[PDB]
Amino acid sequence: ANPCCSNPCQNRGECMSTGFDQYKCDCTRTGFYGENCTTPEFLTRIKLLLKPTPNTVHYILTHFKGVWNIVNNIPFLRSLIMKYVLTSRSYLIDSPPTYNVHYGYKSWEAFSNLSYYTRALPPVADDCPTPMGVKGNKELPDSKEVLEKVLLRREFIPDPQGSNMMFAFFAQHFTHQFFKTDHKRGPGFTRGLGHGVDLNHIYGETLDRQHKLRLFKDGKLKYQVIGGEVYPPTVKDTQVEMIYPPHIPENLQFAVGQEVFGLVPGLMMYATIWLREHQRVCDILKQEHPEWGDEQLFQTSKLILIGETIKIVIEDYVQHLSGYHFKLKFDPELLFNQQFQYQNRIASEFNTLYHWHPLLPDTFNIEDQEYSFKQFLYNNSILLEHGLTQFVESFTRQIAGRVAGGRNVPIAVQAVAKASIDQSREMKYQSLNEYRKRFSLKPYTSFEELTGEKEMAAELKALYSDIDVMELYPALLVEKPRPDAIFGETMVELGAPFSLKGLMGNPICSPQYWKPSTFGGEVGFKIINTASIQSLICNNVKGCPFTSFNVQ
Amino acid sequence: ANPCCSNPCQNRGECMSTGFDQYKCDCTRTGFYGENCTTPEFLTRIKLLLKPTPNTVHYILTHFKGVWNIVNNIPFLRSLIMKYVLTSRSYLIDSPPTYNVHYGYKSWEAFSNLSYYTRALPPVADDCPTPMGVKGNKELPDSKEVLEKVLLRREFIPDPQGSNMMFAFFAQHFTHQFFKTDHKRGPGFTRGLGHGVDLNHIYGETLDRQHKLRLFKDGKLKYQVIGGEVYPPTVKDTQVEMIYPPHIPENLQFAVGQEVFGLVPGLMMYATIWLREHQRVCDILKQEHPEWGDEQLFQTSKLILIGETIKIVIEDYVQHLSGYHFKLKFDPELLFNQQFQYQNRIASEFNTLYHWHPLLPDTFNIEDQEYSFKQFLYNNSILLEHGLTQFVESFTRQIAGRVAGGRNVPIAVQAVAKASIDQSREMKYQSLNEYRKRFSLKPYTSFEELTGEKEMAAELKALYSDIDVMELYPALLVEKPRPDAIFGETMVELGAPFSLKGLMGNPICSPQYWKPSTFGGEVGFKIINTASIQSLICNNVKGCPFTSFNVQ
Numbered sequence A, B: 001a002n003p004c005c006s007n008p009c010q011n012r013g014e015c016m017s018t019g020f021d022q023y024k025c026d027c028t029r030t031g032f033y034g035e036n037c038t039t040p041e042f043l044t045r046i047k048l049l050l051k052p053t054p055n056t057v058h059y060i061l062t063h064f065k066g067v068w069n070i071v072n073n074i075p076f077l078r079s080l081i082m083k084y085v086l087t088s089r090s091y092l093i094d095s096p097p098t099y100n101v102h103y104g105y106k107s108w109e110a111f112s113n114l115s116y117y118t119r120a121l122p123p124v125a126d127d128c129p130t131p132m133g134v135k136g137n138k139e140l141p142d143s144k145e146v147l148e149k150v151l152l153r154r155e156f157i158p159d160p161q162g163s164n165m166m167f168a169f170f171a172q173h174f175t176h177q178f179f180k181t182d183h184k185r186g187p188g189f190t191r192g193l194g195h196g197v198d199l200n201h202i203y204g205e206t207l208d209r210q211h212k213l214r215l216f217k218d219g220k221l222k223y224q225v226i227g228g229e230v231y232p233p234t235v236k237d238t239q240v241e242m243i244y245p246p247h248i249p250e251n252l253q254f255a256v257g258q259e260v261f262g263l264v265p266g267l268m269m270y271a272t273i274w275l276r277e278h279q280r281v282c283d284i285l286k287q288e289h290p291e292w293g294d295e296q297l298f299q300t301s302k303l304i305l306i307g308e309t310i311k312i313v314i315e316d317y318v319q320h321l322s323g324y325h326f327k328l329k330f331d332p333e334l335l336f337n338q339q340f341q342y343q344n345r346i347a348s349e350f351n352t353l354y355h356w357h358p359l360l361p362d363t364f365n366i367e368d369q370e371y372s373f374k375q376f377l378y379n380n381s382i383l384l385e386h387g388l389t390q391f392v393e394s395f396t397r398q399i400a401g402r403v404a405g406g407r408n409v410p411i412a413v414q415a416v417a418k419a420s421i422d423q424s425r426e427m428k429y430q431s432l433n434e435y436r437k438r439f440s441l442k443p444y445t446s447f448e449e450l451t452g453e454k455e456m457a458a459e460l461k462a463l464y465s466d467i468d469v470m471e472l473y474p475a476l477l478v479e480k481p482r483p484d485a486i487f488g489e490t491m492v493e494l495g496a497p498f499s500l501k502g503l504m505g506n507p508i509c510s511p512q513y514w515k516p517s518t519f520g521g522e523v524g525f526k527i528i529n530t531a532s533i534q535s536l537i538c539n540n541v542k543g544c545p546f547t548s549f550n551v552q
C-alpha cells in the first residue's frame, strides 16, 4: 500500500506518502532535484566526475609502498593523509541518529530511546507487497537453502591477510561491548546503552555490577590468583551473574563484567589481560598520585584503558585488517578544526556485517593440542592449563578464515549464521543493493558480478532471481574479495564509516577531554599514546610473548 | 588538604594534585602558559585588546534603533548578525559535558550518568579548608540572615521591561521540562534525562506515562470537555499520577504529563493550551496525510511542537527578555557551516540562576479578583471559573517583579529562595566571582560594585567580608540591574550560553532533521516557522485574545 515501498527516492532524498497512492521526495541537501532526487546540481556533476571509486583508491593505499614509506615519515604529510581518511567517510553516518527498527520516519521516540540499535536505512514498510518493498516474491529464499549452498564451509579457507587468532578473538571481545542485542526485547534492541567504546565489557553495564567487580582499594579491579597467576574473581566471591552451564566448577566461574565472555576461552583470555592492565595502570597512577583515593584511581584508569583500546583498534587492528601501506593514526587533534559530532549510536547494519564467524577455525590448536568447538566452549581448564603465555604463543601462530570468500562458515556456528539471515529478515531490512547505493556504491547487476565467479553466482540466481533482491548479510560473506584480502567492497564501505565514528566520536576524543589532565598527568596520557596490542601482551602476559594480529 | 582547593588555575587551565601539597595546571588550549595559565600567547594578547565587553556590547544591541531597523530588514545582514550571537557564546559550554556534583575530575561515570545535572565549574574539594576552597570562614553567612537582609521583598518592585504574567508563567512551565531535580537522590540529580527541550512536561517522562496520556486515535492527546471547553483528562480516567492534595475534586485532578504542573493555575493554563495545540496539529496532519495512522500523527505532531516551542522561546521570549533591538532568529541552517555539537546536558548552575521567583507578584489578579498565593496554589476553580480567555486577558495585563533588583522575593516563596541558598551550598558551589571569571567576566572588587549602591552592599559586607566569597545565587538577585532591565551582567552572561545550547543543540536542529520531511511536509514545517506566543493563543484560546510577554 504505502507508496514509498518502491524505495523511489534516489541519492538520499526522503520519501513520504501524500495520499494513499502518491509520495514525495525530499532532496533537501542531497544535491539532486526532480521527482526522485536524480538530476544533479552543477556542482554535484563537477564533483561526481572527480570522485575516485573506493576501489580505484584502495589500490593506491595498498600499492606504491615506496611512496607511502615517505609520506609515513613526514609527520606533516601523515596526519594530513589521516585527517582525510578520517573525515571523508564521516559524511555517511547520521548524527544525531535517525530511523530505527520501528520508525521508518524520524520521530522523537526513535531519537530518544537508547534501547534500540540505530538504523542506517529505514525498515521496509510492514505493509509493502514484497520483503524488499515491491521487488521479488511474496517470500524470500529458504535461509537454510541459502546457508548450505553458499555459506557453509567445506574445506577450510585461510585468510589471505594472515589474520591470526589474536585478531579473531580480539574483535570478538572488543565489539561485544557495543553489540549486545537485547534478545528479550528483540532484534533491534541492545543492552549497550553506552553505544560505543566504553569498556563496559570489562567494568560492567551498571554501577551495581561495576561495584561488584571492584576492589575498592588502590582503584583496583577485584581478582584471584590461581597458581601464582592473576585471573578474574569468581562468580561466588563477587556476586556478579555470569553465563556458565551448571557443570562448571566454582573456581571456573570467572566474573569479568560482560555477562557472556565466560563461554569461550578466547574471550576470557583477553578478559584476564585487560583485568591485569587495569590494575597495572592503577599502580602507575598510585605512585604518581600517592595522594589519590580509590575512586579517582579507578575512574582515571578506566579512562586510560578506553584510550588504549582506541589506540590499538586504530593503529594495530584496523591497520592490519586494511592492508593499507599508509600508517593509520589515532590523533583526536586532527578533527579539531573540523565539523564532527562527538556522539555515537550503534546501527543494526553495523552489528550485522560484523558477524565474521568465517574467521573461526575448524579446531582450536593451542600448540600441542587440538580442540573441537564442543570442547573449547565454556571450558575452565584450557586457559588454566595452558595459561596466557602458551595461548598467546599458540594463537599468534594460527591463521583464521576468510570472510568475503564464500562457503567458509564453520558448520558448528551454522545455527548462528542462519539466525543472522533470518533475524535481519525480521528487522525488515533492505536489499544488498539499496545498502550499496546508500553508501555510495553502484548496484550489482548480476550475482555473477557480486561473487566474481559463477558456481555460486548461478546458485544464488536460482534462489533470488533479481540481483536487486540479494540480501545484505549473505552477500557480505560471498562477494568477490578485494584482491589478496579478506573482505569485499561492501563489507569495507559500510563498516568503515561506522567503525571510525564509534571510535572518534567518543567523549575522550573531544577537545575538552583530550589533555594530559583527563588522565592523571603526562604519564597516563603517554600510556594512551604508546599503546599497542604488543605492549598490552608484553606488559600483562607472563614472559613477553611477541604478538601480532598477523600470522607473522 | 587538596592543593587545588585554592582554585589556582586561571583562564580555564585544569588543576591536579601532584603530591599532597603540590599541584599542576593544564593550560591546554587556554591560550595562556606558565604555572597558573596567566601569561598569554601573543594571539591571545591581540584578541584580548579587541574583545568588547558584554556591557560595551549590550549597549549597541539596545541602542541605535534606527540602524537595527535597517539590519533587521536586510535578510542577508540579519542572519549574519544572528549567526554571530548564536556562535560566540557557544565556546563557553562543554560538549560533551565534563564535571558533576561528585566529580571535580572528568571520569567516565560523570559523562555516562544522565541522572546528574552537569556542572559548569567543579564542586569544591570536600576536603578544602573553607566552603569556597581556602577563602573566608569555617562557615558561610546564615542563609536566613542573608535571605531577609537582601532578598526578601518589602515593597513590590515592578519589572522595568514590562514582563507580564504570560512571560513569568511561560518560563515556569517551559523550563520545568528540563529542571526537574530528583529530590530523592539529591541536589545534583534530575529526572529529566532528556536534558533539554523535549516537551516531556507535555507528553510524559516515560512511554508508560506517555501512553496513559494518549488517545491513540488521530494521533491525539487524551482530553476532557468541561462546559464546552477542552481541559486535560482526569487523574482517574487516565491513570497518570499527579501531585494534588487530597482535598482536590476528581474533575479537578488534571493529568497533563509533568507530575507537578497541577499545583499552580498558571502552569495548568499553559498545559491546557499546549494540550490543545497537539490535537490541533494532529488535525492539520490527518487531512494532509489521511493515510497516516495514529503513531505517526502523534510522533510527527510532538516533533512540530518541539519546533514551535523553540521558535517562540527564541523569537518572543528571549527577544523580550533581552530588550535587544536586533531581531533574534531561529534558523538551524545558520549553524550548518559551523562547528557545533547537536547535544545537550543541563548544568546545576543553569537551574540555579533560573530561580526567578522575584518575577512573582504579591497577588494574582485575574481582573475583577485578587488571590493570595495561599488560594492560587493548586486550585481547580480559578481556571475553570475564569477560563483560558479571561486569564490570558487578565495576565497579559499584570506586570511582574524584577529579578536583579534586590529585596524582591515574595515572602510566600521565601522558603524556596532560602533552600536555593542552602542547597547550592550543599552542592559545594564556588564563589560568584569564580563563576564570573569562568564566563569571561571580571571579578567584582566590592559588594558595592556588585550592587551598584551601598545600603545592601554594606550589609552583605557585614555577612561575607571578602567579595571573593560572595555566593552566586544571592548575587544574581541583588546585582546592579543592567540599565532599564530586569537582570544583572552575571545573570545574562552565564545563562545565555546555557540557554542557546539547549535550544540549538536539539536533534531537530541538526541538518538531517531540519527539513520539510521530518515534520510531515512543507505544511507542518511552516507551522514551526510561523509560530509565536500570539498564534499559540489565537489558535488555542477561545476568542483570539491578543497577548504578549510584555505588559503592552
Ligand code: HEM
Binding pocket: A168, A169, A171, A172, A175, A179, A180, A181, A264, A266, A351, A352, A354, A355, A356, A357, A359, A360, A413, A416, A419, A420
Ligand atoms: C568463539 C566462537 C564463536 C561462537 C561459538 C560464536 C557464537 C555466536 C552466537 C551464538 C551468537 C548469537 C546468535 C544470534 O545472532 O542470535 C553470536 C553473535 C555474534 N557473533 Fe559470534 N561467535 C563466535 C565468534 C565470533 C567472532 C570471532 C566474531 C567476530 C567479530 C563474532 C561476531 C559476532 C557478532 C557481531 C555477533 C552479534 C552480537 C550481538 O548482537 O549480541 N563471533 N556469536
Ligand code: HEM
Binding pocket: B168, B169, B171, B172, B175, B179, B180, B181, B264, B266, B351, B352, B354, B355, B356, B357, B359, B360, B413, B416, B419, B420, B423
Ligand atoms: C507559581 C508560584 C511558584 C511557586 C509556589 C514556586 C515554588 C517552587 C518550589 C517549591 C521549588 C522547589 C524548591 C527547591 O528549590 O528545592 C521551585 C523551584 C524552582 N522554581 Fe519556582 N515557584 C513558583 C514560580 C516560579 C517562577 C515563575 C519561576 C520562574 C522561572 C520559578 C522558577 C523555579 C526554578 C528554576 C526552580 C528549580 C527547578 C528544579 O530544580 O526542579 N518558580 N519553585
Ligand SMILES: NS(=O)(=O)c1ccc(-n2nc(C(F)(F)F)cc2-c2ccc(Br)cc2)cc1
Binding pocket: A058, A085, A318, A319, A321, A322, A323, A324, A328, A354, A482, A485, A486, A487, A488, A491, A492, A493, A494, A495, A496, A499, A500
Ligand atoms: N583489506 S580490505 O580491503 O578488506 C579493508 C580495507 C580497509 C578497511 N578499513 N580502513 C579503515 C581506515 F583505515 F580508514 F580506518 C577502516 C577500515 C574498516 C575497519 C572495520 C570495518 Br568493519 C570495515 C572497514 C578494512 C578492510
Ligand SMILES: NS(=O)(=O)c1ccc(-n2nc(C(F)(F)F)cc2-c2ccc(Br)cc2)cc1
Binding pocket: B058, B085, B086, B318, B321, B322, B323, B324, B328, B354, B482, B485, B486, B487, B488, B491, B492, B493, B494, B495, B496, B499, B500
Ligand atoms: N535585558 S538583559 O540585559 O537583562 C538580557 C540581555 C540578553 C539576554 N540574552 N540574549 C540572548 C541571545 F540573544 F543571545 F539569545 C539570550 C539571552 C538570555 C536568555 C536567557 C537567560 Br537565562 C539569560 C540570557 C537576556 C537578558
Ligand SMILES: *[C@@H]1O[C@H](CO)[C@@H](O)[C@H](O)[C@H]1NC(C)=O
Binding pocket: A006, A007, A008, A034, A035, A036, A038
Ligand atoms: C520516479 O521514480 C518512480 C518510482 O521509482 C517512477 O515510477 C518514476 O517514473 C520516476 N520518475 C522520474 C521523473 O524519475
Ligand SMILES: *[C@@H]1O[C@H](CO)[C@@H](O)[C@H](O)[C@H]1NC(C)=O
Binding pocket: A113, A114, A115, A116, B206, B207
Ligand atoms: C524503548 O522502547 C521499548 C519498546 O518500544 C520500550 O519497552 C522501552 O521502555 C523504551 N525505552 C524507554 C526509555 O522508554
Ligand SMILES: *[C@@H]1O[C@H](CO)[C@@H](O)[C@H](O)[C@H]1NC(C)=O
Binding pocket: A374, A375, A376, A379, A380, A381, A382, A385
Ligand atoms: C576442558 O578442557 C580440558 C583441557 O584442555 C579438556 O581435556 C576437556 O575436554 C574439556 N572439558 C570439557 C567438559 O569439554
Ligand SMILES: *[C@@H]1O[C@H](CO)[C@@H](O)[C@H](O)[C@H]1NC(C)=O
Binding pocket: B006, B007, B008, B034, B035, B036, B038
Ligand atoms: C600561582 O598561583 C599559586 C596559588 O594561587 C601561587 O602560589 C603562585 O605564586 C602563582 N604563580 C604565578 C606565576 O601566578
Ligand SMILES: *[C@@H]1O[C@H](CO)[C@@H](O)[C@H](O)[C@H]1NC(C)=O
Binding pocket: A206, A207, B113, B114, B115, B116
Ligand atoms: C548515577 O550515579 C548515582 C550515584 O553515583 C547512582 O546512584 C545512580 O544509580 C547512577 N545512575 C545510573 C543510571 O547509573
Ligand SMILES: *[C@@H]1O[C@H](CO)[C@@H](O)[C@H](O)[C@H]1NC(C)=O
Binding pocket: B374, B375, B379, B380, B381, B382, B385
Ligand atoms: C479555589 O478558587 C476559588 C475561585 O477563585 C476560590 O474562591 C476558592 O477560595 C478556592 N478554593 C479553595 C479551597 O481555596
